[PDB]
Assembly symmetry: D2
Homo-oligomer: 288 residues x 4
Amino acid sequence: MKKIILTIGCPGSGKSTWAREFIAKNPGFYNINRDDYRQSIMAHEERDEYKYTKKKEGIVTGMQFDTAKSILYGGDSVKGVIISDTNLNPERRLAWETFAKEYGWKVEHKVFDVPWTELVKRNSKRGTKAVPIDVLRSMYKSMREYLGLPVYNGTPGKPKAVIFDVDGTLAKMDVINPMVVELSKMYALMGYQIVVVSGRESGTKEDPTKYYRMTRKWVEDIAGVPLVMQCQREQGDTRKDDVVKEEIFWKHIAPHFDVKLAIDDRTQVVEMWRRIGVECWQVASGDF
Amino acid sequence: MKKIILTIGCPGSGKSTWAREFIAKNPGFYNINRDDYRQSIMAHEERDEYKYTKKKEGIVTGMQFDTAKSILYGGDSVKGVIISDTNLNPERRLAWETFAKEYGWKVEHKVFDVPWTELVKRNSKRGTKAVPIDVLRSMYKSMREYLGLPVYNGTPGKPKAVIFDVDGTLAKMDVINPMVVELSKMYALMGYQIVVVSGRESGTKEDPTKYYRMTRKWVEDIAGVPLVMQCQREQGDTRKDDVVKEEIFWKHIAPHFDVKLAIDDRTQVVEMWRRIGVECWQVASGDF
Amino acid sequence: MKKIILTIGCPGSGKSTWAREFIAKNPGFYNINRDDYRQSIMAHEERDEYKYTKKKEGIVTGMQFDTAKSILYGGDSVKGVIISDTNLNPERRLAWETFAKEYGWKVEHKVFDVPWTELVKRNSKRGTKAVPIDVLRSMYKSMREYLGLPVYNGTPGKPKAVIFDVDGTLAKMDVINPMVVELSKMYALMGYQIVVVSGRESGTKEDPTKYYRMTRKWVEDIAGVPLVMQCQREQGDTRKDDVVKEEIFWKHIAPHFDVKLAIDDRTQVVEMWRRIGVECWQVASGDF
Amino acid sequence: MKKIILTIGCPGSGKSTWAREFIAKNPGFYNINRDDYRQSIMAHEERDEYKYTKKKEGIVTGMQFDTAKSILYGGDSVKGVIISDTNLNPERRLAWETFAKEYGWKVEHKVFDVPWTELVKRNSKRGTKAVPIDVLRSMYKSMREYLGLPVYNGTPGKPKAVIFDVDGTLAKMDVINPMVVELSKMYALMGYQIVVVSGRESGTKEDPTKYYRMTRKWVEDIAGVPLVMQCQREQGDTRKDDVVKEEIFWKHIAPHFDVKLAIDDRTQVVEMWRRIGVECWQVASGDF
Ligand SMILES: Nc1ncnc2c1ncn2[C@@H]1O[C@H](COP(=O)(O)OP(=O)(O)O)[C@@H](O)[C@H]1O
Ligand SMILES: Nc1ncnc2c1ncn2[C@@H]1O[C@H](COP(=O)(O)OP(=O)(O)O)[C@@H](O)[C@H]1O
Ligand SMILES: Nc1ncnc2c1ncn2[C@@H]1O[C@H](COP(=O)(O)OP(=O)(O)O)[C@@H](O)[C@H]1O
Ligand SMILES: Nc1ncnc2c1ncn2[C@@H]1O[C@H](COP(=O)(O)OP(=O)(O)O)[C@@H](O)[C@H]1O
Ligand SMILES: [Ca+2]
Ligand SMILES: [Ca+2]
Ligand SMILES: [Ca+2]
Ligand SMILES: [Ca+2]
Ligand SMILES: [Ca+2]
Ligand SMILES: [Ca+2]
Ligand SMILES: [Ca+2]
Ligand SMILES: [Ca+2]
């Protein structure tokens, strides 16, 4: 059965680079792409900004439809086609299936799950092919939905709480950040539990809690934060703050507290927070 | 007297485009640039990421120095040279002056003040020449210092206050944003004055306060914000929220309140806030 | 009646640049191009060399066909489509007509006649989109056929002759070029008439035959060429040798001699010769 | 002793690509290039055509001089510099040596000998960095001089002769090419020896002279060429006509005849001919 391969990925995820190699190595496969049909009908040059329109979309969609049938209905030489779009819209994916079922073709996916941080990196250097940051956030939000990743929706019965980070949030570089520290105390009065988190490694190979202890002491004897729990990146862990903090949240926090907010300063972490369903306020420029 | 023209501008401000035209129109002028000397000593290709180093910088600085003397010491045909770097570091600018004073040359500046918003726009499409967002923020911070633009440092004797925006901050799209509304009341108890601001146009040409009135009512009868002042973009004003809110701050707020914080959601406005010396917490994704 | 506009031109003739502007200025027009469909089905990157194939061509042709019907069968908003290919193959052009006649559309052409010399120039700088020189010669040969330009096929009854140029051919820079001079005499014995031509301007504004006289004398008293006719670019004429020599051929030579060969050294002139039906031998490197 | 590495090569030979890798792998090495200094002083954009000038050259030369001293006079960290220009001008190369001798540095060369055919290929796709074809011919002529390759200057005492190729020259595709065949006979009368050469493989693995015999017969019984010698690419040889014919010339022709001319049609072969000192007339378009 001739196959139709939908590439599932955010812009900048490796889609096209892979399609080009696959076609180079496997005779009988052809690429179909909407970005290409979008630039061609306007005869746009590499650096022109395409103006979105329902009309133009219907046309490109039509072009994909017709180009698929025509190629798949080619001789026995034809093995399949690659639809190298983002394919991040469920409705769009279903259509390819129904369309494939009536003519007798099968559908396969080829996923390109790339970490948010890397996607941002690439897109900022993508130049003219760059995509706005918010449509990127949205694309990734859809990718997570495709993978079936978790979205927090609260913890019924458990005490409400606010999450505070240390570096850049409660501490500056350490001295206290007056308004944020005053906030944690403000929330405490209001009856909320104060959970503290930090991406600082706990300690060294020989003293595995050196930094943790220092952090705890600082929070207690300088900031005076009435916290109930403190969590930190374990010693030895070299993964991204991104991954580290989320792992800590599902394993040590979500099951014990009804978190209604998170206070942080580092964009990637802030991005992780909103992304998983936790309101987050960014208290300072944290593009690093 | 032969002149040395320093272009003052952030990356993406028009520096090079102007230098190329000026040289094309004025015989006897030559360009000197560090980005160029930086890529050349490494024989880098358009898409390689340059690795910063003191050594490599000393070399490029040396190259600028020597290339300046050699060209300016050319015949009578030579009129001057353009130093098309950002030139946003005061120390760096002084050096060119002292250097120019000993050989008998004069220094002129050619400023390229472009709005933050536009600088971001261009840099995100700059592709490989793109610069990290934080070094851009920093460059612009220096540009503002060069222009002598105002930086807020408080208001002694006046009552402390927090600034809250409406769209996206207190209101969602309208329904209340629970945590942020709860915050304004929380600060009020703490003794702070609550100043409300909005980029929403006050009204229409025929009803110049239509939206203002609606906003006031909403803040009063739905959010229940104990505000003391509300300010909004005047009817007819079509400038950027960027400019609008800052104008409102210096004219109607800074002189009446000791503002210690601002709550907003739109990145450009948040960026304006921190930029002028006002702590600001971004309560939601606002890349628009 | 909705129109289909075929752009007639060699690669590098301005086709696409015009299509982009036309579409920008005229709402309801869309571009259709085979180069675009060719790079897309292979998911090729700007710098990949496309491998020609009947299969791949049938597919792109199919894509043009289907994309035309689908767009032209759009609402009343649709005004037409531009087929921005070279369209230099008569058979190909007919197809568009027959195809247009059955669905009720009309066909218009938009010619981009650019001089060979300029086409070469652009193509050598076209980089990756560059086309081999021989396919370019061929494209231009078809363009000339489209315009109905003249192709020489002899002159019955008139005496046979060979055409010799002076600069670079008979003369070097002047001293004689031994073999070529020996040739003209060799042909004379064989019974051929020797016609001499030169792109050298005849003279100056005040002495309109200064150079002609000098050339005649040189050919007579140094080379010893038994010529019957000498023709030169008139004084004041600043057009390309290209145009100049061909004008001279049809007006002063073709009607008086049965030319069976031309001896020249400058590539553009040599190219003109073969192009119009006259065998030509290039006696030296003349890329200038 | 700190070294100065001059890269010797024609444009498009791999110079820069190598310099970038070498510097990437060897800490303490820096690149110096005139193309880079040429585009920088004019602040030119990738696609601008640089206007040559003595003034601008003196400046770039000065920049190379000063940049060399300054870097080589750096700490002990500095190992050397790469001068990635063509370096094909002997005078220019000497200067680097004398310059290197007074400051105590040594000079090394890194040759990039690439075949003419490949150099043309690359340059035609080089786009904006492309170089005119004649300056390329000239560069390669200098490269050959650097390598010490042979240039023919005649054969005293031996009988004069003309060299004729078969495919495209004497034969068309075979039928006779009337004027060229008539020429060989014309030269024979004049007392010249007619040497025939062909790039056609002599035969097959099982019949190693199949094609040679066919060619000989054709030349004898159809063209009627009064030849004295016929030479052909041996059976099995898969090298370029380029190399094949030159090998045949020095081994089987130059020592037996005083060749004063060569008649061919294929550009690369014609290019080889003039290049080694043999007048050559190109009788037809042979860009293949
Ligand atoms: N492994 C990688 N590391 C860094 N960048 C990559 C990698 N793979 C691809 N890229 C780059 O990411 C960008 C997106 O490429 P692509 O695969 O074509 O996806 P899309 O379909 O969104 O264009 C391109 O600029 C490409 O060169
Ligand atoms: N008026 C403009 N509008 C939009 N973009 C511009 C404008 N002028 C220049 N640019 C672009 O901004 C970028 C920065 O250009 P440039 O003047 O060379 O500054 P820099 O010295 O930082 O490279 C380039 O991509 C350029 O083409
Ligand atoms: N007036 C002009 N002068 C010089 N070059 C031009 C001119 N107009 C277009 N070009 C260039 O010629 C090349 C061919 O352009 P284009 O119109 O797109 O034709 P094609 O359909 O063959 O690609 C491009 O590199 C383009 O920028
Ligand atoms: N092995 C190769 N095969 C084909 N092209 C190459 C190869 N190596 C380099 N090139 C290309 O040849 C051109 C000349 O490259 P470069 O080494 O930089 O020489 P130059 O100093 O003249 O610029 C470039 O476009 C480059 O990418
Ligand atoms: Ca991630
Ligand atoms: Ca932090
Ligand atoms: Ca601004
Ligand atoms: Ca807002
Ligand atoms: Ca012409
Ligand atoms: Ca000539
Ligand atoms: Ca060679
Ligand atoms: Ca041949």
